[PDB]
Prior knowledge:
2 copies of one chain form a homodimer. Helix content of chain A is 56%, strand content 21%. Chain A is α+β, with helices and mostly antiparallel strands. Chain A has 2 domains: 75 residues, Orthogonal Bundle (Helix Hairpins); 128 residues, no CATH class. In chain A, strands 2-4-5-7-6 form a 5-stranded mixed sheet, covered by helices on one side. A two-stranded antiparallel ribbon of chain A has the order 1-3. The two termini of chain A are 35 Å apart. The interface between A and B is medium-sized, with 31 and 30 residues.
Amino acid sequence: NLDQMKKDFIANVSHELRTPISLLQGYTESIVDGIVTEPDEIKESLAIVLDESKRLNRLVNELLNVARMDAEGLSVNKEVQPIAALLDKMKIKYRQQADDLGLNMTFNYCKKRVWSYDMDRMDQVLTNLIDNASRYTKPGDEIAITCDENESEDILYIKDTGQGTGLGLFICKMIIEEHGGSIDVKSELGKGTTFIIKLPKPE
Amino acid sequence: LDQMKKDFIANVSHELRTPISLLQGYTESIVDGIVTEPDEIKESLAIVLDESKRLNRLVNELLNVARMDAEGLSVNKEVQPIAALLDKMKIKYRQQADDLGLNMTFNYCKKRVWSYDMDRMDQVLTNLIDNASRYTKPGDEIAITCDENESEDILYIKDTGGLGLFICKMIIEEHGGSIDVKSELGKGTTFIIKLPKPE
């Protein structure tokens, strides 16, 4: 039923991208065709144009990450390497967008831990999870990534204080399972959501 | 083919970035009070409008290709006229043919029943017309015409000018048909689709 998931994802994505385009087109045309005229209304219109343009950028980057994840398939080549190297990439990648969205992003208790993972594939996974949290969050919210371990497994928590579709998270689950690991989620309609990634310790 | 898809996404990433950067940058200069004089704002919003149209065209072309890949080789031909398909194309590209200054002509196609999967052929014709739209300029023409040989129905897509085309070929071959391409550098390209007659 992967095929149907892909169809429903594409259907949902089409709507989510067309809507912001139709909105910033209509507001722009409204100004250039002389329908909106009052300075306050021109300014409110342009603020929406800018907001929709930023939302489109975020939607497009999220979709392309899902596309790359899918195109790379199940190819996982784990290397023993610090987990902090991956989290530091996530930290620079989302530094500006966290500013923009008013989000506090934290990376906690991971210093000097050496894990076994595929950097490029886990980048794709963490991108999709952060992208997901960034959808459902508001200014003043937090996205906290925390490391832990049990006797056989390294553990990453991604927590936020926050058919259509699940594909992104379903591909994430496949990549993690190809690491020999697991992913679970807990969500409360209070508080927010936590993803739990477990990966086998380096042998 | 994994490198075809990887190369397509890389190309798509590059082409989407430009218009999105322009929309955001040229708008923000106005909201932040950097670009202020009426002449100036007019020229900036013309760019935003033009780039929003470009983005939309690109997004629709990409999602069509995604839908095509997602349905794989699923073809269920149904016996029905072709004019139903070409009517949807005419509607779907009416506004875009203005935006780009293109003349899209659809010759008369007698309403004999063809045999074809509407949604897969819609996808195919969308991709071929999208393709022609990116190799033309204002003034140019895209003309769709129907023909027949003894055992096949023939659609010609000719204009006066990767992965998408490859999947088009797969879909047409699953109809039991064939796709060919002809091009005289300068004059333009002709795609030739042959489908088995129903009867």
